[PDB]
Subunit: 170 residues, 6 copies
């Protein structure tokens, strides 16, 4: 089974979710999942020499307004491998509806005091937004980053996404 | 299920195939699949300080004249992880013979760096030489010897892929 | 199926076992398997700047005193990826109790790296290397308030007996 | 001695120049040389998660129209270490003007990597790779508020002429 | 000339100092400088599988109580290469014993750290990890080190100025 | 000053020598020193996908064959950076010819990595590792049409004898 379907959204939803990582921090290769099997698949090589600034993936058993799993960005000191599960605490949301959750690992004590969007250095939020603003520029795509929402908003959206998945897939 | 059996050979065969990568470029560890489970498995550590010059794996649902999956070499700038699927355009074929053990050479469809690589003449000669030399010498300390009987072009590679897709059906179908 | 349950303990047990690697040498991230799915999972980031000194994982279809799969440490020159199977020759065993639980761990070498062809017993390992591995286990959870006791190292015969015992514990637990 | 002053511009200028590399391909840290000593120095950490797409450095004993050493970008498969000299064949030139000054940069390949033996002019480079390099320079300082315009790429002949100009400009300035 | 002797202590001491890095974050090899030449030298391979948690080096033209240059620890996201100079803002000081204290600093030119100005800006677990590294990394060599705690940015800056003065006394 | 000329051969020659490392284990880029400045320089990219199996460099103030520095190979677990000095204990010597000239190379271990404390002679090295090093030298220039011949390995006593000869020749010939 594709792990997107097999894994639960999290152990204490929405305060703690599972993040199924597709793309380790530092990658220029953009990975996704094969729909039928759930094997890792190369979506594309980014057209610019940019790298993912976060460990990037999806929350299992979620679906969202834009017709795809709900994306999640986990701040990790040492990247994980693709297809690794991280227990993640949502701390905010990037408003790109194609919004993406920002989260920290529960089990890295470095981040113990990161509980809301105000705990993240502004330069780091700017770097993440800039990456999503420009990484597909050479593919003729544009995106506006509207801004960042707080942890409460992120959690509300996670609950919506958990419900949408149950509705679409049963 | 073992992904070698579960995945299709490609989305537009033989122009575009799936390469199931087993070994990232730069690895001295030689990985294969466990037959029953499809888990990555260490076949061996190469006996010499050589590394794979390409991302290396197999085309799903293929079987080749030599009684193994058909091997494919994908030229990647940044290596992928083992068990990653790459949509790949065949551009040629290495005529390795230990005895028909030929291997497809391909480029990723979705790396625009390679957009104009469509045939064997598009590859730098020194790079074809480096790949051939690797396969010529990497098992020398294991007492194996192999001959590289040249490179074939994209048309030849594509024909061989279709033959291997049919071989698999004959064997497992 | 979780590969811990699906994969046999090894091709020629206990002389050659399968090591199902969870943590590559050089990682500070400590990985484990999700019970239901067998996906790789982050257990924790180590609280100190230590890295795993060996490729670390479990022997499939084993269980041990501490209520977990039997752990195995494979000495690899180039680390493997998580969820890679290595055919491993046991050469010794680290006798360690964690919070009062027997939590011994097999030490092994890859059968198919000729560098290790003459490593067959615990006496073939450099003393400083055994010391470094023991020290890692002695101190890696110190900042989590744990204290671990390292008893010493057993030989290849002792390791192999424990592997067979653990294969049997698994059958009792899950059979 | 600062190697930027001590080394010659090249062994056969402008056909073959020395590239003194400051920044390996793959770095997000932007390095420069300390003026007095010639040690490597961190200029900045790029404000965006971008990495240098080329091995990046300077041609010794050059000075360019923007009042700096003339920059050179060497296409390398495996990155070198900072302060490594590469014998480099110029193949083209990136026409950049940033913050309002003419800050063009040579594009070159290593003479001694046979992979690049048939790269001799700008037409030999994949278009997407030229695009990626230009986009990096167009956007890597966006979060610092810096204006940039990439006018396009010149050919090997143009690059070589500019190198000779820069060699002479250094003489004209430093003696 | 050995860069320890050749470089100045910093461009705006003690607010901004130069850190001459010897050991990148992530190294298990412990490097130092050859005294005569200033070439990087392997001091030892750490006896345990620990890696440096910070980019580690010295402040040029300093000397300290224990008869050595004043050590500095710089928090980088991406490690630098040995013999790289970093312009560094001191934010605190690890107290370790003769006094063998070590400055904790952040790079001026990484905006990630713009709001790191004092020891209270550092995650507690990160301070704990650095202290634990120094407490235990020589344990297999028979050494013990008590970590006495962490001082603040003001304390760190005073010690930097004291060390610049001690160098002048030692070397002229 | 070029460190090859400035540094001494070692602190207790020939029992402990200095190895000035040019090429870290794992490199496919072959580095050398610029004669005039002593800066690291790319000699070539190896024509085959092979990497140096050891940390490779030279013993300072030695004169071998045609007046070249004596080469030394240091076995390191974690590679060092180019231009790093390692205190090294010679344990053997690789006897080989390159383009028809004797071009023997010392094999050594780091004094200050306790992993290697009991490595003191050529018999202490796994046979497969000696074979891997020899094979690298046998084949790494094959695509350059270069002819190398590998003769075998000498022991620590022989290695030390050859180091001292090269130290003495430098005393006679340099300058
Ligand atoms: N094979």
């Amino acid at each position: 089974m594709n792990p997107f379907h097999e894994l639960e959204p999290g152990p204490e939803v929405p305060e703690v979710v599972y993040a199924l990582i597709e793309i380790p921090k530092g990658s220029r290769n953009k990975y996704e999942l094969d729909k039928k099997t759930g094997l890792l698949k190369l979506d594309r090589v980014l057209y610019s020499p940019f790298f993912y600034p976060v460990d990037y993936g999806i929350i299992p058993q979620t679906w969202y307004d834009d017709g795809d799993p709900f994306d999640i960005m986990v701040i990790m000191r040492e990247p994980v491998y693709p297809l690794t599960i991280i227990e993640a605490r949502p701390i905010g949301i990037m408003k790109m509806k194609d919004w993406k959750v920002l989260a920290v690992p529960v089990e890295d004590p470095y981040f113990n005091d990161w509980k809301d969007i105000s705990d993240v250095p502004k330069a780091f939020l700017d770097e993440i937004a800039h990456f999503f603003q420009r990484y597909k520029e050479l593919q003729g795509k544009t995106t506006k980053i509207e801004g960042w929402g707080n942890a409460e908003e992120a959690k509300r959206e996670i609950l919506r996404a958990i419900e949408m998945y149950k509705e679409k897939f049963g």
